[PDB]
Structure 1
């Protein structure tokens, strides 16, 4: 098997969608997967994301259900540390009393961290394990959910929907459209302000739209580049040469040691940006 085929296989997702003969079946080739329209699902991404979210929620439910209100145990001390950190972060950014912001920030941070963490495992372990368990050698399986633009886009779109919902809730459709078309530049007379509404819309709508796109792409680019560089280094081992493999080990170790920082930092940035975006939807910044 060639290195190019190795990379091409590693770059493909497990897709379930509408075959020409019915709305049931898994794609066996990249072309067949791309033939499926918008109504298809990446099974590996959704499965891993739901599994990791369920694991995190179960672990945090175990400590919360038996809160001692005294000397904390080993697990609930860690849970309290995380909750205190999230609460301190929320208090320094958001001055309202919305109960949704803090649990949302905690969920976002821990979920994204857990999704990024599985990139540190060797690239060939989980796909080969899945191939052996299912018995199919040519099985598409990608573990890291955050390297799929669909997951990051879903997170960013849900955050954007929350932004719009809370802005409308706290300002009426009236104040929402007013802030979108009239606020940054205002005039005492009607004729000037009418000429100003296109400028205000052009300045506000672009910045409003750019938020979910940046939120998704900042995470996606970092995770995708990290996984792709991890895949490329594995090819150096595949050459079988002594010299090339020795350098590959050092490169992989350095990349992982650098990548743990990126894994933590991207989740922290996503949490902070979500908090900031939700806080500026309850106030007026222009």
Structure 2
């Protein structure tokens, strides 16, 4: 009956790649790039802002207030662009699931966060970034000892377990959440149509809020992990 782990795979460089996930990641990237070029054309400081300017201003002021509260914009200015792109890129990648792309069952487009490779690309990039930023501020060897010491030096094994748990939590929370939605839509499609639409619309409506809340959790927790890596 059901299927879940399958992908439209290809070999690109001896490495095995998914055609789905990658095209969905490309569509999310192209939508975010197009929306950013629309801002670059239409942005006004003198004249009253349009909706796309109001959107990026609301996200930028929100993520700036978080960076400024957590660590300071003078210390960590590179975290603001990263928090903004993490939010907007996850948000669009999640919200593309609202499209009616299911058919007799298969979908023309998976949400990219239903693939472990996508969430590892985001989480392991963020992990390398806050450790590299943490080293550039806490020292090459000074940083690694502060990761062990934490706030209470006797807890050093628990502090090491926290540093291992962060990239795994970022990965598997985002994956497990969007992957759950991917399983729910195929088991809802076991209903006949006269009734299928009601559980489907209930799920897709809450999956818009959940898809936005995910994007926000990943962006907030990214800013906090930068603040912990750059403290003292």
Class of the TM-score when normalised by the shorter of the 2 chains: 0.7 to 0.9
Higher-RCO chain (CA-CA 8 Å, sequence separation at least 6):
2
For residue 64 of structure 1, report the CA deviation from its aligned partner: 2.8
TM-score (normalizing by structure 1): 0.72
Question: Would you identify which runs of 4 or more consecutive aligned residues in structure 1 move more than 3 Å?
Answer: 125-129, 180-186
Note if 1:16 corresponds to 2:10: yes
CA distance in 2, matches of 1:247, 1:266: 29
Q: 1:122 aligns with which of 80, 83, 100?
A: 100
Q: How does 1:1-286 map to 2 (within 5 A)?
A: 4=1, 7-8=2-3, 11-17=5-11, 39-74=15-50, 75-97=52-74, 98-125=76-103, 142-182=109-149, 200=156, 202-237=157-192, 245-284=193-232
What TM-score, normalized to structure 2? 0.87
Q: Pick closer, same or farther for the CA change 1:79–1:203 going to 2, 3 Å.
A: closer
Structure 1 residue ranges without an equivalent (≥5): 25-38, 130-140, 187-195, 238-244
Aligned length: 230
Residue 281 of structure 1: SS of its match in structure 2?
helix
Structure 2 unaligned spans of 5+: none
Answer whether contact 1:167 1:281 (CA < 8 A) is retained: yes
Contact 1:46 1:145 in 2 (8 A): yes
Partner secondary structure for residue 17 of structure 2: strand
**SS of match in other structure, 2:70:** coil
Structure 2 residue aligned with 1:132: none
Query: Aligned-pair distance for 1:116?
Result: 0.4
Mean Cα displacement is larger for which, 263-272 or 53-62?
A: 53-62
